[PDB]
Amino acid sequence: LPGLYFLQAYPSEEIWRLFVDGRFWSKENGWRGYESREPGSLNAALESLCSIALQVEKSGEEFELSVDLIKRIHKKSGKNPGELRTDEPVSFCIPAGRASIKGIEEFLSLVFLTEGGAEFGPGKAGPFGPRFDKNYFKNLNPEQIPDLAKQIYFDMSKYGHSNTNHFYLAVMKNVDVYLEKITQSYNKEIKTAETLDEKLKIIVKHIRMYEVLHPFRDANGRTFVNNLLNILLMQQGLPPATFYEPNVFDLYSAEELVVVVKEAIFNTVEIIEQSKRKTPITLYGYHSSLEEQTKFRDMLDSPSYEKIKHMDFSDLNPEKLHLKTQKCLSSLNEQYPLHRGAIYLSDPGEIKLLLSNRNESQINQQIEQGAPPIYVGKTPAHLAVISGNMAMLDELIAKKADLSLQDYDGKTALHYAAECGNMQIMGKILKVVLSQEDAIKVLNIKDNHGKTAFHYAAEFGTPELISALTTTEVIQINEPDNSGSSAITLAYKNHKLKIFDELLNSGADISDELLDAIWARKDKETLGKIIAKNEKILLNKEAFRIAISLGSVSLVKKFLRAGVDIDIPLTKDKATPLMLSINSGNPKLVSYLLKKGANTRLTDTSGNSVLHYVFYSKAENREALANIITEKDKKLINQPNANGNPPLYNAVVVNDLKMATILLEMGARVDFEDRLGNNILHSAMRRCDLPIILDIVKKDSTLLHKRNSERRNPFHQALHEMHTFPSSKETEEIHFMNLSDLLLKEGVDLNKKDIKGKTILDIALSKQYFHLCVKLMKAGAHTNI
Amino acid sequence: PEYDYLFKLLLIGDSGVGKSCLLLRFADDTYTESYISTIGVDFKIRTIELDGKTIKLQIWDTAGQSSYYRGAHGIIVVYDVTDQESYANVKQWLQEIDRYASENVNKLLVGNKSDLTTKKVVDNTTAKEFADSLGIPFLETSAKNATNVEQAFMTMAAEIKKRM
Numbered sequence: 005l006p007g008l009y010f011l012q013a014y015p016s017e018e019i020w021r022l023f024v025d026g027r028f029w030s031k032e033n034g035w036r037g038y039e040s041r042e043p044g045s046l047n048a049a050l051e052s053l054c055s056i057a058l059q060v061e062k063s064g065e066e067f068e069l070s071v072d073l074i075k076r077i078h079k080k081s082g083k084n085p086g087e088l089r090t091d092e093p094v095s096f097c098i099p100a101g102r103a104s105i106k107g108i109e110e111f112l113s114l115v116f117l118t119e120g121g122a123e124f125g126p127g128k129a130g131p132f133g134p135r136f137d138k139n140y141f142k143n144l145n146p147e148q149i150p151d152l153a154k155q156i157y158f159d160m161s162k163y164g165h166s167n168t169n170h171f172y173l174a175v176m177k178n179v180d181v182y183l184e185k186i187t188q189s190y191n192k193e194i195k196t197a198e199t200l201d202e203k204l205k206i207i208v209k210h211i212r213m214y215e216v217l218h219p220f221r222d223a224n225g226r227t228f229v230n231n232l233l234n235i236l237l238m239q240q241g242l243p244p245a246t247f248y249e250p251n252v253f254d255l256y257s258a259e260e261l262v263v264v265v266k267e268a269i270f271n272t273v274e275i276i277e278q279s280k281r282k283t284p285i286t287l288y289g290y291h292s293s294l295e296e297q298t299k300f301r302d303m304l305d306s307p308s309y310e311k312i313k314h315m316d317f318s319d320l321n322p323e324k325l326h327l328k329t330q331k332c333l334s335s336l337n338e339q340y341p342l343h344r345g346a347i348y349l350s351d352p353g354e355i356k357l358l359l360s361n362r363n364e365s366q367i368n369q370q371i372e373q374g375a376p377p378i379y380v381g382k383t384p385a386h387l388a389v390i391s392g393n394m395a396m397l398d399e400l401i402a403k404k405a406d407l408s409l410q411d412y413d414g415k416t417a418l419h420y421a422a423e424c425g426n427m428q429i430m431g432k433i434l435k436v437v438l439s440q441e442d443a444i445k446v447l448n449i450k451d452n453h454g455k456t457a458f459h460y461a462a463e464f465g466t467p468e469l470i471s472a473l474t475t476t477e478v479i480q481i482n483e484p485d486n487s488g489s490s491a492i493t494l495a496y497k498n499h500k501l502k503i504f505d506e507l508l509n510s511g512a513d514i515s516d517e518l519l520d521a522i523w524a525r526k527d528k529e530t531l532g533k534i535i536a537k538n539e540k541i542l543l544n545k546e547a548f549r550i551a552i553s554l555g556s557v558s559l560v561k562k563f564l565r566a567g568v569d570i571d572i573p574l575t576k577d578k579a580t581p582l583m584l585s586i587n588s589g590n591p592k593l594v595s596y597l598l599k600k601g602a603n604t605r606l607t608d609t610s611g612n613s614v615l616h617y618v619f620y621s622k623a624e625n626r627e628a629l630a631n632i633i634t635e636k637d638k639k640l641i642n643q644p645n646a647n648g649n650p651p652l653y654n655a656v657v658v659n660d661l662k663m664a665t666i667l668l669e670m671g672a673r674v675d676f677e678d679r680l681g682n683n684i685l686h687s688a689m690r691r692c693d694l695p696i697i698l699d700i701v702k703k704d705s706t707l708l709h710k711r712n713s714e715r716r717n718p719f720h721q722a723l724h725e726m727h728t729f730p731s732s733k734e735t736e737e738i739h740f741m742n743l744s745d746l747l748l749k750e751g752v753d754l755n756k757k758d759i760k761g762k763t764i765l766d767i768a769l770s771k772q773y774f775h776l777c778v779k780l781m782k783a784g785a786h787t788n789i
Numbered sequence: 790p791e792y793d794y795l796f797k798l799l800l801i802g803d804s805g806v807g808k809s810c811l812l813l814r815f816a817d818d819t820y821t822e823s824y825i826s827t828i829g830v831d832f833k834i835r836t837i838e839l840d841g842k843t844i845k846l847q848i849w850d851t852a853g854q855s856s857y858y859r860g861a862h863g864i865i866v867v868y869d870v871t872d873q874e875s876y877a878n879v880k881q882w883l884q885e886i887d888r889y890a891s892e893n894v895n896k897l898l899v900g901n902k903s904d905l906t907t908k909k910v911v912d913n914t915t916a917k918e919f920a921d922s923l924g925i926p927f928l929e930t931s932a933k934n935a936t937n938v939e940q941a942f943m944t945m946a947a948e949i950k951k952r953m
């Protein structure tokens with residue numbers, strides 16, 4: 005039924021390429037990145053394509069596109085999965101580089117999107133779904149659509165070619181209806197199909213609308229593009245589709261998608277053809293090192309495929325297939341053969357012939373929108389540099405091809421030469437670039453990300469490459485990108501150490517942004533290398549902070565050797581070094597600062613003593629710190645002038661009894677009271693949740709009702725609002741051991757609210773009555789007014 | 790594993806109110822004046838024993854920039870007491886759970902930075918009045934003091950246990 009000889013013929017060593025996108029191979033070391041992402045996910049996705057392959061052959065019955073199969077393929081993909089979407093919002097971001105002016109016209113033209121009310125247009129992301137500045141579907145005049153297509157492409161582009169300003173939420177009603185009227189409409193037109201190519205147009209036109217509907221919660225792509233499309237291709241005796249960028253089925257015109265598929269078809273054929281030659285394979289600038297190749301075969305698994313490898317296809321003759329493929333793969337040559345040349349060609353004899361007598365307008369042609377997404381914006385130079393086709397780059401350099409030109413993303417030939425990190429093709433470029441008069445300019449060009457040629461070289465490449473870039477004497481090493489990340493900063497974040505050391509040794513001015521990245525990783529040593537190699541970054545306040553916060557006594561020592569005040573406020577809230585030393589890190593640091601004579605009696609913006617900052621540290625190290633600091637000062641009674649409650653309060657509200665006890669044991673006074681009139685008990689009312697302390701605290705002092713909420717107990721019940729039923733027996737039980745104490749101390753039992761509410765009305769509202777209500781009434785507590 | 794509930798919780802609100810500071814004070818039981826960003830960890834976990842039943846809490850923090858954020862059983866909408874605008878935007882945050890999440894989901898309003906009493910703009914009773922109009926539980930918290938941080942997550946844990 006389906007031919008699928010190609011899949012069996014497909015070299016079992018390098019069959020990973022069917023499910024991994026070509027745009028990854030170069031940078032993500034082939035399949036590694038896709039394995040790293042979700043390990044054995046390709047093994048299941050290959051299984052999903054090969055388990056469906058066996059199920060559409062054994063069935064026979066001139067099998068047509070069934071909705072029950074379209075579900076089954078999602079069950080092989082893996083609230084329940086493999087079920088249709090119904091009133092579940094699923095949206096996503098699509099960039100200008102995955103769009104076309106004609107593709108937009110087809111997207112807007114689809115009435116079933118406008119009727120269904122699928123949010124489309126510009127706006128920023130949200131935590132659940134998108135938030136739109138405008139919606140193009142509500143009140144849309146189909147005579148505006150053609151001028152509106154360009155108008156939105158200008159908006160999509162002007163923001164960024166590979167960035168996203170525009171989100172799209174799918175229709176959240178009539179999913180099961182719309183999917184069925186397409187599945188049928190496909191079986192309707194595959195009949196009408198007359199020409200061999202006309203078949204390929206309706207397949208993509210249908211799998212487009214399929215993709216645009218976005219029924220399934222997730223994995224709309226792997227099901228409808230990586231699987232279904234291949235099945236439809238394999239059935240008409242065309243091979244699988246090995247794509248570069250298969251995510252254009254949203255905003256690419258039906259005819260434009262035929263090109264994208266034909267390219268992906270030609271890509272697969274190329275893998276087949278090259279594997280027979282036994283020539284080394286290098287498509288989209290990806291070399292296969294024996295290590296990766298050998299490590300794959302023992303980790304391959306995917307047996308449902310293994311049985312359609314050990315299967316007999318001798319009955320069908322392959323040369324009847326070859327003559328069929330060439331019919332649709334003869335269209336690709338004519339349009340932009342230079343660009344396509346840069347991707348696939350190798351033989352200089354063939355390359356030189358192609359470029360024989362090419363004019364200056366033709367040699368520097370940037371493919372305009374609508375064409376497949378890889379080409380759009382790129383000079384043949386760009387592609388030649390990307391795919392590592394030095395053979396093509398030589399002959400283009402021989403024609404004096406303009407290398408200063410930049411694509412729609414804003415990257416020049418030099419940018420890709422750095423990003424792809426080929427020092428040999430980078431070499432050939434530099435020689436030509438330096439020859440130009442505006443070479444100092446050309447070198448210092450920024451893309452739409454702001455990142456210069458050098459920024460890409462730091463984030464990706466070797467020190468020898470960086471050396472060949474710095475030898476130029478551009479002296480734009482210090483400049484940041486749009487994000488504010490310096491050359492050296494990007495180098496640090498991506499663990500490019502030997503590069504980072506070379507950029508540090510070069511003495512690139514340090515950036516505040518980098519020190520915060522050093523904090524996130526908590527990298528003590530790199531700061532140690534920075535302070536050592538720079539050796540005047542000890543004036544930097546934020547550098548001293550990260551040295552105090554996590555940093556060793558040794559790191560901090562270096563800053564006091566440099567000699568800046570031991571009581572210098574160095575955060576927004578005017579925290580002392582000593583204060584920040586307590587929060588976290590080694591208590592050896594606290595004791596050192598105190599030894600050096602660090603002022604104990606200071607207060608942050610909020611008025612909190614050093615001993616307050618003890619209770620911003622994890623409860624484990626709290627006991628040691630509290631003892632170390634009270635040995636020097638012994639003024640714990642000191643408290644936030646702002647509120648006026650000392651650390652005993654802090655101890656209560658963190659529920660740390662061990663500290664609440666030791667502090668009371670240290671003879672911590674219970675006289676204090678916040679500005680709003682609340683006592684320690686008011687806090688220790690419920691939070692403490694243990695009567696042992698409540699007894700010992702009440703032994704010291706008398707409680708006093710304030711802010712029209714008596715004592716702790718009165719205010720206890722006002723703060724227990726939820727009164728959870730499972731613990732409501734425990735909630736009416738704690739107040740027992742609370743009140744039989746209160747009754748000794750004859751609580752006056754006044755009004756206990758600013759809306760005339762009191763202890764007896766609240767308990768009655770609380771429905772904790774069983775215990776309190778009666779025990780209060782017996783005790784002589786007046787009923788509610 | 791065999792742990793009783795394993796609840797999924799979500800802290801959402803205007804960037805700066807202290808969603809991160811709250812989470813670290815609940816999870817790690819600490820407070821630092823700056824934001825570590827926890828190297829974009831994107832979530833935190835803590836196991837709590839409520840009603841003699843051991844409950845795990847998977848707690849997700851909202852950043853500035855595979856759709857895992859719908860999965861939550863409860864959403865803690867946070868605002869800053871010292872920022873009127875951060876409370877004004879609460880209404881839009883409450884109608885962004887009406888769109889892209891189950892109406893069965895349990896909500897909770899948290900007014901963070903209660904310790905900055907000296908610089909308090911948003912009124913206790915005004916917020917309570919608003920929170921009780923929609924039948925939502927309301928708590929004020931200080932990640933710094935640690936006041937009501939446990940109570941904040943404990944009430945949210947109990948609020949879903951009841952309904953679940």
Ligand SMILES: Nc1nc2c(ncn2[C@@H]2O[C@H](COP(=O)(O)OP(=O)(O)O)[C@@H](O)[C@H]2O)c(=O)[nH]1
Pocket residue numbers: 610803804805806807808809810811821822823824901902903904905930931932933934
């Ligand atoms: N005074 C005070 N400041 C706080 C409190 N909680 C958070 N902050 C401040 O809020 C800033 C950032 O907090 P963060 O948790 O990152 O806010 P997010 O953007 O909501 O995550 C920090 O610099 C803190 O100083 C608090 O309870 N009291």
Ligand SMILES: [Mg+2]
Pocket residue numbers: 808809850851852
């Ligand atoms: Mg945050």
